[PDB]
């Protein structure tokens, strides 16, 4: 059967979620359903029709046409990208692991922990751990001594991330003192961190490279900049997650490599990712 259950997750500009036009999904979007709970003390809820678009949705449309499959797209509601809580997965990875979806499409980072329980496509956009600063600030990257040994400098660099995600876990494993120091500058979200940068409350923001590149590209006044791509730490990419040993992996991989080689991927990046800022 070439009709597949596919899970996604809202994160602009990769997956943007809209309501139906007051009653179909307007063009450039695809239908995506979302289970909406009645309240927080029940599992009862209602399936709501939504409309999904963005960089990775355009990937899915190309794949569906090239690999020849149909799909029912739905948005994850327990968790986000994929986190193992007491050896039990949530998010998009959990949907694939526990076989409610055969494919996950979104801003899903390829890492070792997830690849042990799901199969990953080839990466379709590069990402990693990057650093964003105000224009003029000099840092080399995550491994900069200004981050590793913050108190070797006076005043110490004020830098943080959004906790509970992949970035904090990587820093905790790799740079224990940097993690200990930077929790004082924990940011509640990406938008919060951008404001702290632009208002001088923060010197640097460490986060996903693809997201930081998108945010710097559209920053008002082009005041926020990221490090060069050669300094991104733990270079990886967003990939499509499939069930372990899935028969779709090979043709999905060849389709994505075809999109990259023939300029289709660059067109989607121009359409969704590249901003006005240099």
């Amino acid at each position: 059967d070439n009709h597949l259950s596919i899970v996604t997750l809202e994160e602009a500009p990769f997956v943007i979620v809209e309501d139906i036009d007051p009653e179909t999904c307007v063009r450039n979007t695809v239908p995506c359903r979302k289970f909406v709970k009645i309240n927080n003390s029940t599992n009862e809820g209602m399936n709501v029709k939504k409309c999904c678009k963005g960089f990775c949705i355009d990937i899915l449309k190309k794949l569906s046409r090239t690999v020849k499959f149909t799909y029912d797209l739905y948005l994850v509601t327990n968790g986000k990208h994929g986190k193992k809580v007491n050896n039990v997965w949530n998010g998009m990875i959990g949907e694939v692991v526990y076989q409610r979806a055969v494919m996950a499409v979104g801003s899903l980072t390829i890492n070792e922990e997830r690849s042990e329980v799901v199969d990953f496509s080839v990466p379709f956009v590069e990402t990693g751990i990057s650093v964003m600063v105000s224009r003029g600030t000099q840092v080399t990257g995550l491994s900069d001594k200004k981050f590793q040994r913050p108190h070797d400098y006076s005043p110490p660099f004020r830098f943080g991330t959004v906790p509970n995600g992949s970035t904090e876990r990587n820093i905790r494993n790799n740079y224990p003192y940097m993690h200990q120091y930077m929790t004082r500058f924990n940011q509640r979200g990406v938008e919060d961190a951008l404001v702290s940068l632009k208002t001088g409350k923060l010197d640097a923001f460490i986060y996903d490279a693809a997201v930081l590149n998108y945010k710097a590209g559209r920053d008002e006044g082009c005041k926020l900049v990221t490090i060069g791509s050669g300094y991104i730490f733990a270079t990886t990419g967003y990939g499509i997650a499939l069930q372990k040993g899935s028969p779709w992996k090979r043709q999905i991989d060849l389709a994505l490599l075809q999109f990259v080689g023939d300029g289709e991927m660059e067109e989607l990046e121009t359409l969704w990712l590249t901003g006005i800022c240099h």
Binding site: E116, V122, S143, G230, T235, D262
Partner: protein, 275 residues
């Protein structure tokens, strides 16, 4: 039972130096004090000393996955493209691609570009290095980059080329939009990157289109050379294995773990990044 590893001369990923008369390899350390691990390579019949980025990665993969190896340099000196067999409808790969598919090698450990053409026939690891394509010229040569008029409207007064039977050769041959540029390059392509880089210094080749991870290292060591500083296409290097090889899964897991380990960051600092 010993994995046959094929590789290629391509600094800073693979250095190739003569052996000592002992048959062993000169012991060195980096300027920062780390040991330079060297393995014996055979190549064009003679034992030699090989070391660098991809050799460090091979040693890490071998220790992690608990296998032994023997390294040899690709006999024809090429990376690998697919060519028509004359008087035949058969096709065959040259370079390291051909050695892997024929069985002369069990694994390609080299700056081997992942693309759709090669992925049809072999299995790539997850990328151990992300980079792209750029242009190298002699200091004093001034071009804007891939869209410079002297490249889009070629002529015999400005000679640009790439390496024969390489991923870059594939990339320009396949795209309709690069038909004019490819017609110029196929008359001037070089047998290896080292010969092309030397031709740029000797002012016999005016522009060299090649991998950024290699060209930027060359510019950082040879003051008479500069790059455009611009990546016009992004790609990655992967370990190459045959279809359904028993090492595919764990090789990719080790590469992902090494990226998140900071181990690839250590290799990047040791071999790739310079002034």
């Amino acid at each position: 039972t010993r994995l046959k590893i094929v590789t290629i001369h391509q600094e800073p990923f693979v250095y190739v130096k003569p052996t000592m008369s002992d048959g062993t390899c000169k012991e060195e350390f980096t300027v920062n004090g780390d040991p330079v691990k060297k393995v014996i390579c055979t190549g064009p019949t003679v034992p030699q000393c090989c070391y660098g980025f991809c050799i460090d990665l091979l040693i890490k993969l071998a220790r992690t996955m608990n296998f032994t190896y023997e390294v040899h340099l690709v006999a024809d000196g090429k990376f690998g493209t697919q060519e028509r067999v004359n008087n035949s409808n058969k096709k065959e790969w040259n370079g390291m691609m051909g050695e892997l598919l024929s069985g002369q090698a069990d694994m390609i450990v080299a700056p081997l570009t992942i693309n759709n053409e090669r992925a049809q026939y072999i299995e790539f690891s997850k990328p151990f290095k992300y980079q792209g394509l750029t242009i190298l010229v002699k200091k004093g040569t001034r071009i804007t980059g891939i869209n410079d008029p002297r490249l889009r409207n070629p002529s015999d007064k400005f000679i640009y080329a790439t390496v024969k039977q390489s991923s870059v050769d594939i990339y320009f041959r396949r795209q309709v939009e690069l038909s004019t540029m490819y017609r110029h390059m196929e008359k001037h392509n070089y047998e290896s990157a080292a010969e092309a880089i030397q031709a740029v210094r000797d002012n016999k080749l005016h522009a060299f289109i090649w991998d950024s991870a290699v060209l930027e290292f060359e510019a950082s060591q040879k003051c008479d050379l500069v790059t455009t500083g611009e990546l016009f296409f992004r790609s990655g290097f992967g370990i190459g294995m045959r279809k359904d090889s028993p090492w595919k899964q764990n090789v990719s897991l080790s590469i992902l773990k090494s990226h998140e380990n900071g181990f690839m960051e250590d290799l990047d600092k040791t071999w790739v990044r310079y002034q």
